[PDB]
């Protein structure tokens, strides 16, 4: 039927907790395998962590009782055009509501090799999975403490 | 306002969450329940002609979940003139629709003109668009890329 | 900034190195943004209903049941971030918000909407012998989002 | 000690990062007919001039005259329904009354 | 058809 | 003590030495439009860098 | 990444009387009078299985000196098998030196 | 036996 064609999972408001690649690149020697470029979309990733977009959940009061003070407080049966056709009735509200909300994310990406010369103007770029600019980005402050390793 | 003939009708700047147009319908080109269905969607700023709102000197913008797309300049004020297409529909008259059973079906093209306390809805001509322009709609419902 | 751009921070050598990059970031993502495709979606509804050219009586209840038409649609949502359900009804509105536009005008009945997202365990009020729902109600309880369909759509 | 070089920074040493994605756009279609997100495969080679397959052949070459290891940090999300069958939060046995007479 | 049964609000 | 002959390599053949060729074209597709408003074929300019990831 | 969050089911049993009446049916609660067979009281505190994402550092491990461009990753479940409730799993690993020959 | 006492909803 479909128990095979597909699978029953849980309700994700985030709907697609996506990752996003962080990549400043006039600093880091570019990790392995990335080719150096200045095509905003390739930009050798310096580190990735997923979206600051997670899901919080609450208790929608007495579920359907929250719904009867919502078919009456909305003043309209806007969605719920048919408050009698069992089938077409504004679906019951779930016991538990879920809300996409974003938190800030403080993350350590590790330590990476950097060029020995940094131009006073470093350019940083947060790339999204399908590699592009995400404008829902609010304030992104990266700090990086250099350190020694190896020797010639 | 009071002291200089300005009517409550024409306040002109009202922040507010709501999807005026939700109760829309294609054919009347109005809101069938006679109500901007009282539901919270996301902060929005409704305006009248000429009047606007500048945030430049403030952050509340970020609260109103509304922000410039090149967040680094200042063409950033919002005027009646920018919310194109995002005019509130206008609202439909319910009672006019109701009483109307005269022998007939015309009954209702009449879009509520003013509310009970007789405060005007500045409907406009055509009678399907009140000259109340709201952020949300324009952005979300009406204007492609202009 | 510009002139500074030229000058160089000079990490030295006779030994290269790297840096530990810690980083802070915040975002304001509306659960139903379009850029994340939590906005669009396809689905096909009924768009036409008649019978082949002779209106009523012998098939006056049956003529209505003789010609149906379906078409694919990409309908959209108003961006924002909404509760589990809210989202649903928003489509379960904008799915109607298509019908109203084309259904009424072409004999399609509300009866035959054909695409309705909804949480509920129709069958919960079941019974073996009647093979029906004894309370005369798809017991109005939230279980998990679901999509109800009619034929073809 | 002839040496033709230029930009394209010396295939560098001392530690880098290895990105082990899964939904990278090409990986999918060449390789993820086979299954899900519990197991898959990914080009770790981030060169876009390569179809996953051909990239598969080429080698990331960690060197030697000294072996090493890697610090594996990892992100993961799941959508598990509390009463799934695969976790047996679905079945259960019990015996009830099934007959009554005299 | 307006598709909204009027007077159904409690 | 952490002295090194650590070496992360792979394909992308060692920016090699000992002699190569330098292609000095002129009608290479991008050179034209960014640089050949200025003049003809008697003098022009060309990217000798054959990396297409670069304007 | 499956943990449990808890809430306050409002006035416990008072949440239940606006649930034997809002459900429209006494679907479970077939018998609203047989003290024994009555849809059990709702608890003061409801609990919900919800999944969070899990960012974890596993430690540092030895790796072969040659990696095929196509690494295969697999998240195995306790009774060792594929768990398809897995949503998106991104592992990253920074190599590093140790020892020497 | 339908096992559902009808009219018991408040």
Author numbering:
A (entry chain A): 391 to 542
B (entry chain A): 205 to 307, 348 to 390
C (entry chain A): 103 to 255
D (entry chain A): 52 to 153
E (entry chain P), H (entry chain P): 12 to 21
F (entry chain A): 48 to 102
G (entry chain A): 442 to 542
From the paper:
Dodecahedron-base is a small icosahedral virus-like particle composed of 12 copies of the Ad3 pentameric Pb protein and is capable of efficient cell entry. Virus-like particles, called dodecahedron-fiber (DF), are generated during the adenovirus serotype 3 (Ad3) life cycle in infected cells. These symmetrical, dodecahedral particles are composed of 12 copies of the viral penton complex, which comprises the pentameric penton base (Pb) and the attached trimeric fiber, both of which are essential for viral cell entry. Through careful examination of the crystal structure, it was determined that residues 48–61 of Ad3 Pb, the Dd building blocks, interlock within the particle through strand-swapping. The strand-swapping considerably increases the contacts between neighboring Pb pentamers which otherwise associates only through three small loop regions.
An orthorhombic crystal form for Ad3 Dd was obtained in the presence of an N-terminal peptide derived from the Ad2/3 fiber consensus sequence. This crystal form contains one full Dd (i.e. 60 copies of the Pb monomer) in the asymmetric unit and therefore allows improvement of the electron density by 60-fold non-crystallographic averaging. Using strict 60-fold non-crystallographic symmetry, the structure has been refined to 3.8 Å resolution (Rfree = 0.280). Additional electron density, corresponding to the sequence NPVYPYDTEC, was visible in the fiber peptide-binding site of the Pb, confirming that the highly conserved FNPVYPY motif of the fiber mediates the binding as previously described. In addition, the conformation of residues 452 to 467 of the Ad3 Pb corresponds to that observed for Ad2 Pb when bound to the fiber peptide (pdb entry 1×9t, ). In both Ad3 Dd crystal forms, the visible electron density for the Pb peptide chain starts at residue Pro48, while a very strong positive electron density (>10 σ and >18 σ, respectively for each crystal form) is consistently present in averaged Fo-Fc maps on the Pb 5-fold axis and coordinated by Glu451 from each subunit. As Ca2+ was present during the crystallization, it is most likely that this density corresponds to a bound calcium ion. Due to methodological limitations it cannot be excluded that non strand-swapped dimers are present in low proportion (<30%) in either crystal form, however the strand swapped form dominates.
